[PDB]
């Protein structure tokens, strides 16, 4: 089976920051740069 990312899957970076996907937003809902580029992941600053 080819598994795509879904709500409840666990993501992490190399610096010990880990969490579960809790929301998958449509592209038009994500914050974007003034040039029109949406971001891919939103991380809480309270974890640092």
């Amino acid at each position: 089976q080819k598994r795509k990312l879904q709500v409840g899957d666990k993501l992490a970076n190399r610096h010990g920051n880990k969490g579960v996907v809790a929301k998958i937003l449509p592209v038009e809902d994500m914050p974007h740069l003034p040039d029109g580029t949406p971001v891919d992941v939103i991380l809480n600053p309270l974890g640092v």
């Binding site: 598994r3 990312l5 879904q6 709500v7 409840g8 899957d9 666990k10 993501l11 992490a12 970076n13 190399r14 880990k18 579960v20 592209v27 038009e28 809902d29 994500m30 914050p31 974007h32 740069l33 003034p34 949406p38 971001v39 992941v41 600053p45």
Partner: protein, 48 residues
């Protein structure tokens, strides 16, 4: 900018590119429910 309202976030945000790994722990392999099923030999309690 906010994708829903179109207005800017009131403060500048730390936007960047980060390397994120998808870990082996997936909710697909962990969701489980039961109503009735196998029972133990001696105690007759549900199996685990």
């Amino acid at each position: 900018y906010d994708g829903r309202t179109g207005e800017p976030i009131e403060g500048p945000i730390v936007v960047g590119q980060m390397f994120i790994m998808k870990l082996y722990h997936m909710v697909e392999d962990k969701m489980h429910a039961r109503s009735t099923g196998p029972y133990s030999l001696i105690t007759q309690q549900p199996l685990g």
